[PDB]
């Protein structure tokens, strides 16, 4: 029951940017100001990317809090007969929807609903001050959404294809086969899926017709010219009529490009303005190649003062795994905290040679990735990460370079989880966990991005028989033979491995994290040695095994389905460690001091290096090999083997899952600031860390266009309403 609501007491923290703001020159501030705005604008697209009803809910909420703030609306709600606790549930839901840019959780892809009675909420709404100034729109919004706002029907409970779940990346009638047929179409046409959606219409015969729609300001109308424009037309692919179009999110992307172009005026150099230029092209024409071009310049731009990025980037929430969720961020580099990470880059080339694969499976060059520590001013999208490795185009990754970011003010925000909130750890591990967790975190973040995602080469063949490796002389360490598998033109990591692609890659990255933290240089660069370093190493591992148990809450047994890719990866690593045996890890079910079912994880530190290391090395080798050669049959067999959740002894993971569910703790919500223009001077606005303050932070987010933005989301939404 507790899975589908947010609890009234859910944590809220405020991201801290003041001193990072103070560092910025008058020009950098205006650059950042126009960039944040673009980010925030596009962030609203994530709504259409969540659920059918999400746009309506956001418009309903923003209209409510425009007319009355949480304290004014409280007066009305309590006159209407709500208890303070019911009203609080409302705030929390509002905050959650704002926080997620939708009514499904970003971490776990699960629906949440208001924790108060429906007929009660309706009173707070229909009788509100907002309903008095515009009764037409308010009553029309509540009619189109409120049912779906509360509906827990099993098919609505999680994101996904088929009738199992909800997805807006696809029309409701789509299934896994549709997505696969589409993926194949996009590949033969050498067209990226990051920015698209799939809509399916059927005639009276029942014959499926597919619209692949690209995101852009320009409709399919009389364009300028492009690599996109030549592709707008009807095709026939394996018996299926295909139409490629554009104009998705058009009026939202228009606001974005307006702000990017304003930003261009304040750009610090030629790389920044050249990338923004290409960004504008990308969002105007719907050209993903124009994004790649922009990303190239952005990689060239090293150690800026204000760092940022925008676009359709992460493919996590596309059920199939090829489609990206819009996001953008604006951040200030921190020179101090960036010192260590540069020491890390200086020694990275060295450290790569510790990884359990030949130089033939490692990238030919090793350019310098430029790792930096940032303080986030704005992160718009489904959620805020700890660290990032970008961009996501692999050709650029190995021919050009990439950037690594640790966001030091996101880390700082969670040092949280007080001792009583530490589940399944013995008293003595609790102490170490509490002491070394933060430092253990800085390390895993660094190794993960730099050496985890930034290592490894893919074997490719272009239009000709030309390989980026040497075919005849390259030996596969597993097969003792030549390389029989590789990527062809149009093929990508995401297209080939699809469903497991995002997670499999994450599993690889966190495994090198665990593997290389054992090295003493890695640890001294972060400033630890002796009886400190060994403690952070330990907790890193203890942290991983624990997280693999907690991962269980994100598995859906009925569907045999993992809902979060980082959690699945951590469960796989937990299982690889268990399978090694020899006493490294034990899960012992127990009884809680509160009487309910509990459990204990035990890690033996003396066996990490003797048992654990050998196990991970073996695992890593198999992972890279299958990725480089892009072997999907093998890759899937290996990964879906370890990812299988069963009741087999001694673990009994299905049964354990129930104890995990019982003891689960809900993820905190984070409040972000607002930048305001006074004229030449720009200022930073801050908010209370509570549901109310997060609501206000959105209330004041769009002072100019808020009412227009709402109607825009509304119409974008009803236009496509026939598809779900």
């Amino acid at each position: 029951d507790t899975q589908y609501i947010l609890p009234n007491d859910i944590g809220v923290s405020s991201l801290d940017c003041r001193e990072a703001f103070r560092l910025l020159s008058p020009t950098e501030r205006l650059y950042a100001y126009h960039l944040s705005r673009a980010a925030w604008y596009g962030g609203l697209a994530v709504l259409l990317q969540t659920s059918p009803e999400a746009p309506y809910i956001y418009a309903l909420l923003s209209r409510l809090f425009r007319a009355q703030d949480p304290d004014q609306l409280r007066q009305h709600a309590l006159a209407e007969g709500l208890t303070e606790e019911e009203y609080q549930a409302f705030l929390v839901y509002a905050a959650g929807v704002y926080s997620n840019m939708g009514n499904y959780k970003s971490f776990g892809d699960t629906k949440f609903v208001p924790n108060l009675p429906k007929e009660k909420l309706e009173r707070v709404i229909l009788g509100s001050e907002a309903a008095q100034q515009h009764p037409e729109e308010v009553r029309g919004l509540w009619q189109t959404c409120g049912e779906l706002m509360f509906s827990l029907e099993p098919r609505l409970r999680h994101l996904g294809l088929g009738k199992e779940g909800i997805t807006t990346y696809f029309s409701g009638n789509c299934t896994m086969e549709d997505a696969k047929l589409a993926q194949d179409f996009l590949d033969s046409q050498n067209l990226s899926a990051y920015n698209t959606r799939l809509f399916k219409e059927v005639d009276g015969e029942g014959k499926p017709y597919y619209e692949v729609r690209l995101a852009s300001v320009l409709g399919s109308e009389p364009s300028l010219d492009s690599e996109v424009t030549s592709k707008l037309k009807s095709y026939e692919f394996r018996g299926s009529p295909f139409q490629v179009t554009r104009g998705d999110y058009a009026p939202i992307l228009q606001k974005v490009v307006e702000q990017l172009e304003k930003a261009k005026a304040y750009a610090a150099n030629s790389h920044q303005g050249q990338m923004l230029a290409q960004y504008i092209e990308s969002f105007t024409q719907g050209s993903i190649e124009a994004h790649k071009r922009g990303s190239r310049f952005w990689i060239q731009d090293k150690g800026p003062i204000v760092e940022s990025y925008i676009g359709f980037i992460e493919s996590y929430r596309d059920p199939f795994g090829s489609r990206g969720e819009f996001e953008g961020f604006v951040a200030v580099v921190n020179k101090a905290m960036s010192a260590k990470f540069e020491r890390l880059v200086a020694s990275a080339e060295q450290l790569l040679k510790e990884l359990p694969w030949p130089p033939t499976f490692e990238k030919d060059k090793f350019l310098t990735p430029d790792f930096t520590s940032l303080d986030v001013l704005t992160f718009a999208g489904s959620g805020i990460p700890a660290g990032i490795n970008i961009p996501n185009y692999d050709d650029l990754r190995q021919t050009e370079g990439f950037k690594n970011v640790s966001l030091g003010n996101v880390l700082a925000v969670a040092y949280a989880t007080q001792r009583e909130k530490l589940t399944f750890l013995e008293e003595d591990d609790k102490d170490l966990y509490i002491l070394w967790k933060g430092p253990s975190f800085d390390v895993q973040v660094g190794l993960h991005a730099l050496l985890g995602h930034g290592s490894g080469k893919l074997f490719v063949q272009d239009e000709k028989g030309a390989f980026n490796f040497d075919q005849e002389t390259v030996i596969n360490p597993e097969t003792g033979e030549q390389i029989q598998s590789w990527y062809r033109s149009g093929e990508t990591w995401d297209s080939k491995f699809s469903t497991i692609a995002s997670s499999y890659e994450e599993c690889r990255a966190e495994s090198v994290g665990l593997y290389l933290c054992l090295h003493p240089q890695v640890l001294e660069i972060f400033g630890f040695e002796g009886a400190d370093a060994e403690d952070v190493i330990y907790v890193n591992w203890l942290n991983m095994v624990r997280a693999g148990l907690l991962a269980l809450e994100f598995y859906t047994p009925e569907a045999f389905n993992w809902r979060q890719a980082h959690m699945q990866a951590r469960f796989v690593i937990l299982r690889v460690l268990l399978e090694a045996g020899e006493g490294l890890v034990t899960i012992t079910p127990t009884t809680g001091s509160d009487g309910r079912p509990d459990a204990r994880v035990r890690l033996d530190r003396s066996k990490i290096r003797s048992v654990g290391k050998p196990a991970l090395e073996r695992f890593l080798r198999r992972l890279q090999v299958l990725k480089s050669t892009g072997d999907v049959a093998g890759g899937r067999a290996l990964y879906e083997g370890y990812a299988t959740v069963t009741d087999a002894p001694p673990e009994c993971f299905l049964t354990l899952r129930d104890t995990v569910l019982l003891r689960k703790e809900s993820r905190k919500l984070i409040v972000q600031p607002n930048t305001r223009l006074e004229g030449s001077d720009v200022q930073l606005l801050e908010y209370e860390a509570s549901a109310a303050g997060l609501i206000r932070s959105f209330s004041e987010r769009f002072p100019e266009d808020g009412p227009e933005l709402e109607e825009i989301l509304t119409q974008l939404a009803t236009a496509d309403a026939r598809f779900w």
Partner: peptide, 5 residues
């Protein structure tokens, strides 16, 4: 690619 907190 992301690392979550």
């Amino acid at each position: 690619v992301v690392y979550p907190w």
